[PDB]
Each structure stands twice: as C-alpha cells, then as structure tokens.
Amino acid sequence: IWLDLKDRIPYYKSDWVDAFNYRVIPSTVDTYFNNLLPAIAFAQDMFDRTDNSYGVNEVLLSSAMAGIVFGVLAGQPLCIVGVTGPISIFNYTVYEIIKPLNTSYFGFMFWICLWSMIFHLLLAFTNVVCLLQYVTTFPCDIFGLFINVVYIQKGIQILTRQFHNTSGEKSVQDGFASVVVALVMTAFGLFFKSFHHYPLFTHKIRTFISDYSTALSVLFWSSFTHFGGYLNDVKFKKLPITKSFFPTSKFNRPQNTWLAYEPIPVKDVFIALPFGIILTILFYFDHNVSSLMAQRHQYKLRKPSSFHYDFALLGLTTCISGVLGIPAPNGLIPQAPLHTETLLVRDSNQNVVRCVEQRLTNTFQGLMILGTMTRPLLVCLGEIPQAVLSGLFFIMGINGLMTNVIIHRIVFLFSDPKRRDNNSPLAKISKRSMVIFLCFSLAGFTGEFAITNTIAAIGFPLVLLLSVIVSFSFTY
Amino acid sequence: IWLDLKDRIPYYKSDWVDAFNYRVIPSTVDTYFNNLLPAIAFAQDMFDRTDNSYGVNEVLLSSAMAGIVFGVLAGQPLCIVGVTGPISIFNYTVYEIIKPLNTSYFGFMFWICLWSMIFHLLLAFTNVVCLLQYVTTFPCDIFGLFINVVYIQKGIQILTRQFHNTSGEKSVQDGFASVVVALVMTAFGLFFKSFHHYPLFTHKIRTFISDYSTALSVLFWSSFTHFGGYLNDVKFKKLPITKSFFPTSKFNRPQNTWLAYEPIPVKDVFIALPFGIILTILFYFDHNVSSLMAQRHQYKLRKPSSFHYDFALLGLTTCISGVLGIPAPNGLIPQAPLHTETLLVRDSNQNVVRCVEQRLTNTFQGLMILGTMTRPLLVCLGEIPQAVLSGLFFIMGINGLMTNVIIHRIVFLFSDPKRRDNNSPLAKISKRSMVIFLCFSLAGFTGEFAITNTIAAIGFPLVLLLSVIVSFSFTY
C-alpha cells in the first residue's frame, strides 16, 4: 500500500508540468458547475426530502472541502469525488429511519462513518481489489447505464416538480414554458458536442467551441433570463440556499479533530452500525467501477497512475465526510471520464493519442473558490435559474448514451452490413450471440427499476457485482 | 401550341397506369397534409386580414377543385399548385385599396381575372417563358429560398400569432406547450427525415418510414395533443370554421361562387388590371421557377410534359376561380421536390429509377372530399392544432435548406477538406471565390429581404430574374 504511494507521489510533483495547455483550462472550468448543479440537483430534492433538514449547504461545502482535501493527499487525480442521488437515498434513509427512533443525529453521523471506516482501514489492505479485475467487456458499461438512467429520470422529476406547484390549465402559467427552456437548451448542446463525436467541422474551431459546452450553455440560455425574454418575463426559478453556515459541531471548541467518539445513551450508541457499512461498500464500489471505466485500456491507461490508493484514501475521506458532518462525495461519474476524453488527443482527427494526466485541473476543480465560496457567488449561482440546470440535466443527460457501447453494439443491428465501424466484428462475428447478450444487459436494465421498488435501486451494483462476475457464463 | 399538345397527349394516355405503383401510396397521402397547412397558413392571416373574406373554404375549395381540375388538364401533374401569402398580399392590396375605392372586393375581382387570362392566352403562345431557361444552376435554388424564408418566418409568426389574440406583448400568453409541441415535433420530424439523407437503419426500413414524416406526424402528434402530453390539461388551440360555404366580399353573405354584380362604371372595371399583371407574372414566375427546379435536368429529367399550355390553362383557371370568388393555386414549392422525394429512389436504392409518375396524388389532393368539402373535413378541421402545423411549418422548413447548394457551399467553409469531396469540386475548386459567389447570392437574398419589408415586396422574383440574369458574368 505504502509502496504504492511511493510510486505515485513523484508524479504528484509532475502534475504541474502537466498543466500547460488549453484543455486544462476548460477542464477545470466546465466541471465545477457541472457537478454542482447535479449536485444541486440531488440536493434539492434531498434537502426537501428530509422534510428539510439543514441539507444543501452540507453539500456545498461537502463538495468544496472534499474537493480540496481529496486534492491534498491525492487519490486519483484523474478521478474526482463528489456526490450522488444515491448517497442522497442513503440519507433519505438516514433521516428517515432515525426519525422514529429520534436520536443523536450527531452520534449517528459520526457513527456511521466511523464504523465503516475502521473496517475500511483494514479493507485497504484487502484485495477486494480483485473485484475490479473482472473487467473486460461486461460490468462497466452497463454500470454507466445504471447511472445514466437514474440521472435522467431524476432530471425529469426535477422539471416536473418545477412545473407542478403552479397551475395546470390555459394562458399559460407554468413549467411548460420552463419545460421548454430546459429542453431547448438541450437540443443545442447536443449539437455542440457533436462534431467531436461524429465529426463534421474544423479542428480547432470545433475544439474551442465544443469544449466549454457546459458553461456555454448554462450561460447561453441563462442570458435570456439575464437580459429578459420573449419568455422569461414572469416567475422563474433558480436557488434557495442560506447566507451562512450552521455549527458543523456539537461540542464547544474553536478548532477540532480526527479520531474520536462522544458522551450519551447506549442503544442508540450501537445501532448506527449497519448503515454506514452499506454505504461504504457502495462507495468503494463506486469509486472503483467508475474508475475502471475510465481507467481502461481503451482508454489506454496504466500510464503512470494509481489503482488502489485512491481507494484507501477515499474511504477515509468518506469517513471524514461523516466527521464534520457533511455529505458523501462520491465518484464523479461520467464526469471525470468525460474529462478524460478531454485530456487527450482526439483533436487529431478523433484520435486517441497522448494521455493527458495531471493533478492540477482536478485539484483546482476540487479546490477552487468556486467549489468553495459561493456566498457572494450566489449572485451567479442564484442567477442560475433552476430551469437552466434542469435543462442541464438533459444536456448532461444525452451524453454518455454515447458510450453504451452495448447500445452501440446493439446499434449495429439496425444499420447496414454495408455499414461497419471498428470493432463491429466483435459482435458481427457473434451475431446472434450478440442479441442474446443484450438481454443480459437488459436483465439488469429492467431489473433495476423494478428493484428500486423493493428496496432502493442503489443496491444494484452489489447485485451487479454478483451478476457481473458470474457472467463468464455466457461468454463462451 | 400543337406541339405542346403533341407531347403531352401521348403521354396523357399513359398516366393512369403510370400512376398505378407502390411509392405512390405514400405520395398521395403526405401531400394532402402538405397542402393543408400552408393553406392554413396563409389562410389564417389572410382571412383575418380581410376581416373575413377568403375563408378556409375559399382556399379549401380553391385547392380542391384546383387539384382535380388542374389535375385534369395538367402540364405537369407531378407538381402541386396552391395558394400563397403573396397572392394574398395582392388580395390585401386589394382589400385595403378596394375599400375606399368601394367596388365590392368581389365585384372588382371580376375584372382582374379576366386580364390574366387574356394576356395569358397571348402568353401561352409567348416565350417570355424563354427566359427562364437560361437557368442552369443559380437562381432557382435561391428562389425557393425566398419561399423558405417567409415560410419559416411565418411559422414563427403564427406561433406567436397564436399567442397574440388573447392579451400580452412579449411576456407571453401562450400555450407554452404550444411552443413545445410544435417544436418538439419539429425535432422529431427532423429525425423522421434523417436516415433518408443521412442513414442509420435499412433502406427498406427507411423506405417505409422516413418519408412518411409529414403525415405521420401530423396525425401522430395531433392526437397526443388532443389527448396527452408529458401531462397536458390546458386550453389547446385548433382550427377555424363554417358548416357551409363561406362569405366573399365583405359579407355575412355567402355567395358560393356567384357573379351577379354586373352593372357599374367601366372605370370600376378598369382598374383591376395591374393587379392582374403582376399577378400573372407572378404566377408565371412561380411556375417557372419552381418548375425548373423541380424539373431539374440534374434531377434527372427533360422527359415528357408542357409548360406552355399549362401555364395558360392554369392561369385561366385562376381566372375562373374568381367567379367562384375563390383564391388561386400557384405552384407549390417545398412539397414539390419532396414529392419527388417520394418519387425518389436513391434510397431504397442509391440512384434512380426515373420515376414513373402520378396524377393520383394530385388529383386526390384536389379530390378527397375532406380536402374539398368541409362538412366531413370538419372533424379534421376541428381536431388539429394550429400549433401542430406550426411544428410542421418547421419540419417542413428545415428541408430545403438543402439544395441551396450554396449553403452547402457555405458548409464547405466549416467542413474540412479532408472530409470534403462528394460533388464538392463543382464548388470546391474555386474555393475562395466560391464564397463570393455565394455571397452575392445570399446577398441577393438579403437585398431582397430588406427590400421585402417594403411592400409590393412581391416584385422580388422579378428582381430575381434580374439578378440571376445579370449574373451572367459572375461565374466567370
């Protein structure tokens, strides 16, 4: 483990070298907000969700420091942690189960984190890490599909929610307008993205333009709201959130600790004990899975970088997330990846060529005042209308349906054998066999919506794991 | 003249059979729709404009008898003739201008038509028609562009129009939803098209489908609109009405095709004349341009039909339409290729089967009773939103950016050489200069565009004619 550090740590130094180009800069930029909004997005629900329970802030922060700290020891700089709708789900639980068993929220928060963690230490030594291995074609892409799906459904909800409080008949007076916006926005974005995946235009030109898609967009629409509309001329949405903080404490101190334990009733002392765990594993996983897809060798990577480390580190950090009291930062699922597409040559034509690896964007991404300070920043953030982001869910959303290769693999079915692209033979050759495969994939695909119902969807990976690993069984 | 006859009559004979085929089936249907909207489109403005005068029916009939009658003598019948905002515009002139000049709109009308004919007879023999011909690549595409432009604008305008009757300035009172749908549709439509220019499933698969965009859609969406939406529960907005025949001069009165006001000064009779001239020309023009473009020796045909007669004939018809007190079918445009797209075969193939051709669609277009008498059309008329059509304005619109080769030739800036190549050299090669050409061209679009804003705006094709002709140089 230690060893591991030793390998990587020089590279830390290198991140600096790594810094010097254009791409660094967007990379840093687009994402911040990019997270944040989604982040927001769960948040929004989350907070409400907890019948309201001092929520957002936690995140805002959660993410911000987490980005920084995560920077400081450093794990994968090519991966970045923050939040999820699913951590949120845990949280829904977390308050929820606690409420009838009203208790030391504080004890709990702490608690959960701690137990997992301890274990985590140990775990860090464990070659759970095997699990990872498993990759070549089955888990991951799929994995990403789970994610996607949830993302989108939520996105919708968010809109729809946004429609709902207000009315539902003629004038109009509603979310419909809104509805439009988010969408409208969506179309364009897609375009913005598009030469890059399926080309058409001038290399650089395309590059300059396509890369800040996210920023651009948020802005792009947003400015209609900033400088009025042929629409945005009535009640519209943006952000609720506080002008301060709350004590992230239940003690008297100025400045505080790491390891600990506090003074009160017993039962309650024990039984936080599950809940973290399940969380933990999840994280682990998450982190892992994600990492894998990114890390991958289509994504040609074993180029000077960290398989484990980031895990050990992570758990602690997560643990820590529990410690001040603040949300679980989670692996920034596509997001990191997409960066990774960023941090590469494809300019070229579309061609993967040299990695681009570094701490710095990510560190910045973690760190930066933006993903930090927000209270005067509020003006932008507040200026962010809720709708834009809803739209964002969408732009964000189509993306990465751009990588369910399975789909792709599917896709080939529709189109011509006098069409072909790349590794179409993988399938082409096991043509029939392909079809079946999809099903497998599909199995999860139903399986999870349905699952969510019997216990939150969140459980799936486990199952997924359970699944995926066995799936050698096709393969034949 | 005889000669003219001399082709067509032999050919005439064939036609029914020629008509009898399976692409046909698709063809026949879309076209109706294809009419209906513009028919609408103009209608709405116009009618209102004439604070009621040529109602739905006026068009409906106009078209309906026209499709068939025009169908019967036909000098092409591949083609489609119907109404335009510009006729209307003339009509508008006539409405206002007539009002303090007091002879009944209708009474006045009687002379107008006459002139057209006569002059037209003379014309039928003429080769002012000669002029067009000269055209080899430049105008026409532009010509159609003129149409496009308005078309789109209008669409929007309608949209907004819809917003407009009930109060508001730019805030806005809309079916936001209206906006949504139409658009939404539009995006889709685009999809509905897309494999056909630019593939992604099977020849055949497309071949039943992509083509059937219009109809499919119109219908397809409209019922959602009638029942359904992501939710929907708002006042939705459909389409205007009469159970009988409509009024003609400012009226309450219907005078379903009548002419009983024959007894006032000569004088009154006299001044219809301008309106005819320009009109005729216009029509002529319409015919021409469209026809050429359509006829396209490039899109493979100098094969057997006749303009000279038809033109007369048509014109006459229009002249007659006036007894009826009905608007005039003129050559419809965007549809016009598109039929040809029906009657395309490069994409359940890749080249051609020079089409066979059909009376039927066109005839049908006249004929189908709905698209003819209202009283059963009623349902249809009642059922669809203006908005759907607006969406239609749009899908229909995007199309037909598309043989503005020049546009393509624009594209060429954006597109990259190491990708550029199909027939690109006709353009490609005098690359830089190309632009210029185009610049002009667009410039004309513009010049005119700007001009259009000045009324009688209509003069533009002539101008088009000018432009293009003088451009004899350009090319060099």
Side-chain angles (χ1 to χ4, degrees), chain A residues 259-273:
Chain A
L259 179 57
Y261 331 74
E262 185 179 64
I264 252 320
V266 300
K267 179 70 107 68
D268 47 301
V269 314
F270 321 121
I271 189 49
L273 134 82

Side-chain angles (χ1 to χ4, degrees), chain B residues 150-169:
Chain B
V150 286
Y151 265 35
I152 293 173
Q153 172 280 332
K154 177 54 62 180
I156 300 165
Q157 166 37 31
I158 292 298
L159 207 67
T160 55
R161 200 185 89 146
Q162 295 150 343
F163 307 150
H164 311 329
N165 168 296
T166 180
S167 312
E169 211 189 330

Side-chain angles (χ1 to χ4, degrees), chain A residues 276-306:
Chain A
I277 297 172
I278 47 192
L279 140 73
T280 325
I281 179 104
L282 143 82
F283 64 62
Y284 127 49
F285 302 159
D286 299 344
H287 194 238
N288 158 31
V289 284
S290 304
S291 75
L292 292 168
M293 165 45 130
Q295 279 160 333
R296 76 183 283 198
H297 294 138
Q298 168 181 329
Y299 303 176
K300 318 188 174 289
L301 238 273
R302 228 173 160 92
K303 286 180 194 73
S305 303
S306 34

Side-chain angles (χ1 to χ4, degrees), chain A residues 156 163-164 167-180 183-184 190-191 198-203 205 229-234 236 348-350 411 413-416 419, chain B residues 163 166-167 170-180 183-184 190-191 198-203 205-206 229-237 350 411-416 418-419:
Chain A
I156 322 193
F163 188 97
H164 308 323
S167 58
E169 55 181 66
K170 188 188 199 296
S171 270
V172 169
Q173 300 192 140
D174 228 280
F176 267 127
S178 334
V179 150
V180 197
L183 293 165
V184 100
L190 134 75
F191 313 140
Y198 269 173
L200 220 337
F201 315 113
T202 329
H203 199 59
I205 90 176
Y230 60 63
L231 290 163
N232 56 84
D233 331 319
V234 289
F236 283 116
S348 48
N349 204 223
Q350 37 191 350
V411 142
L413 169 52
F414 310 100
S415 226
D416 197 5
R419 286 331 116 186
Chain B
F163 307 150
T166 180
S167 312
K170 303 286 172 274
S171 316
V172 288
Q173 267 177 358
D174 307 354
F176 303 148
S178 314
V179 198
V180 171
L183 286 176
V184 118
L190 127 75
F191 312 130
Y198 283 164
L200 293 185
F201 200 147
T202 89
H203 243 183
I205 283 278
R206 5 273 176 159
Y230 275 126
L231 284 316
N232 73 311
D233 26 57
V234 146
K235 187 155 192 317
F236 302 145
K237 298 293 188 171
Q350 216 57 64
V411 171
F412 304 173
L413 168 45
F414 297 100
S415 53
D416 313 293
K418 68 106 72 191
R419 338 290 315 164

